[PDB]
Amino acid sequence: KSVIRWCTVSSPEEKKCNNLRDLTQQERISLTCVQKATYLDCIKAIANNEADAISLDGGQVFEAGLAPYKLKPIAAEVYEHTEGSTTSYYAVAVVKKGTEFTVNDLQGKTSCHTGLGRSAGWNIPIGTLIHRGAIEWEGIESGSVEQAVAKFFSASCVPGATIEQKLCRQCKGDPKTKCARNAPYSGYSGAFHCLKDGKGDVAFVKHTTVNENAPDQKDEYELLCLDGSRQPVDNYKTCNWARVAAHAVVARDDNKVEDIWSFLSKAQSDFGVDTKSDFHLFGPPGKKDPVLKDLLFKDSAIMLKRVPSLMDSQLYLGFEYYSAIQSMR
């Protein structure tokens, strides 16, 4: 069919897609919009030849590539902050300068996490330590990963934890809500404040968190690297626990990939970052309302690049990320 069926997951998103249909309908490859309830319904639909493409973040690209779907990334967003690379951010472990411990001495420390189930604050650090054998968890019949983590750190603040009391012990706030998912210490800024207030020895955040939160106090913090070193906050490119790839358009690996890329390439050429048109494929940024944010593509993306034909989901995401999320299942 010379028809790309884009899959959308909310009604503001379906609207943006239909506006892109109306603006390219007299192009030869046309667009059409299928709306499903969740991104997973869209993964099932692409795999069942019911729709053809959708943009997914790192962990949902991981999901899309598992059997039985075996969807592969075909184009990736590029943002201004990672300088033309298909990277969203790097996950780093932040410590106060002057403490002396390395990753080899982490057992028994206290920790600050952005929240349970979050990518940089839970899935990448804990999966990295399970993959390296520092934390022993063989799989869900054990019980929760929470019980495994609680035999490794002596106490933590993990907003959202429900199984182990230790995991909410370092959290700030009244007993009622200190460990809620929206607590004082949740999120990148709250995991950073947990570290700053001394309630944790390590915070698991991303590479921009000390810059966003304490740009004038960078010198008081260091990064814990996986090889045993500690390095300055600015050295995240050589001291990170994993690179988290950019959002990627996923598709079935088949002859329609060139048609989807041909659509997107003309579409961004006309409606990309520098368009004079009313329609913008990417944003523009600054939408406040969450249901209006990042419709179809991220509002902060500046172009799309096609991913080499030979990169599957494991190669696109990278070994560190892939083995870490693999270990959490």
Curated annotation (Swiss-Prot):
<feature type="disulfide bond">
    <location>
        <begin position="17"/>
        <end position="33"/>
    </location>
</feature>
<feature type="binding site">
    <location>
        <position position="188"/>
    </location>
    <ligand>
        <name>Fe(3+) 1</name>
    </ligand>
</feature>
<feature type="binding site">
    <location>
        <position position="120"/>
    </location>
    <ligand>
        <name>hydrogencarbonate 1</name>
    </ligand>
</feature>
<feature type="binding site">
    <location>
        <position position="114"/>
    </location>
    <ligand>
        <name>hydrogencarbonate 1</name>
    </ligand>
</feature>
<feature type="disulfide bond">
    <location>
        <begin position="168"/>
        <end position="179"/>
    </location>
</feature>
<feature type="disulfide bond">
    <location>
        <begin position="112"/>
        <end position="194"/>
    </location>
</feature>
<comment type="similarity">
    <text>Belongs to the transferrin family.</text>
</comment>
<feature type="disulfide bond">
    <location>
        <begin position="7"/>
        <end position="42"/>
    </location>
</feature>
<feature type="binding site">
    <location>
        <position position="247"/>
    </location>
    <ligand>
        <name>Fe(3+) 1</name>
    </ligand>
</feature>
<comment type="subunit">
    <text>Monomer.</text>
</comment>
<protein>
    <recommendedName>
        <fullName>Ovotransferrin</fullName>
    </recommendedName>
</protein>
<feature type="binding site">
    <location>
        <position position="121"/>
    </location>
    <ligand>
        <name>hydrogencarbonate 1</name>
    </ligand>
</feature>
<feature type="binding site">
    <location>
        <position position="89"/>
    </location>
    <ligand>
        <name>Fe(3+) 1</name>
    </ligand>
</feature>
<feature type="disulfide bond">
    <location>
        <begin position="225"/>
        <end position="239"/>
    </location>
</feature>
<feature type="domain" description="Transferrin-like 1">
    <location>
        <begin position="4"/>
        <end position="329"/>
    </location>
</feature>
<feature type="binding site">
    <location>
        <position position="57"/>
    </location>
    <ligand>
        <name>Fe(3+) 1</name>
    </ligand>
</feature>
<comment type="function">
    <text>Transferrins are iron binding transport proteins which can bind two Fe(3+) ions in association with the binding of an anion, usually bicarbonate. Responsible for the transport of iron from sites of absorption and heme degradation to those of storage and utilization. There are two forms of hen transferrin, ovotransferrin, found in the ovoducts and, serum transferrin, secreted by the liver. Serum transferrin may also have a role in stimulating cell proliferation and is regulated by iron levels. Ovotransferrin has a bacteriostatic function and, is not controlled by iron levels.</text>
</comment>
<feature type="binding site">
    <location>
        <position position="118"/>
    </location>
    <ligand>
        <name>hydrogencarbonate 1</name>
    </ligand>
</feature>
<feature type="disulfide bond">
    <location>
        <begin position="157"/>
        <end position="171"/>
    </location>
</feature>
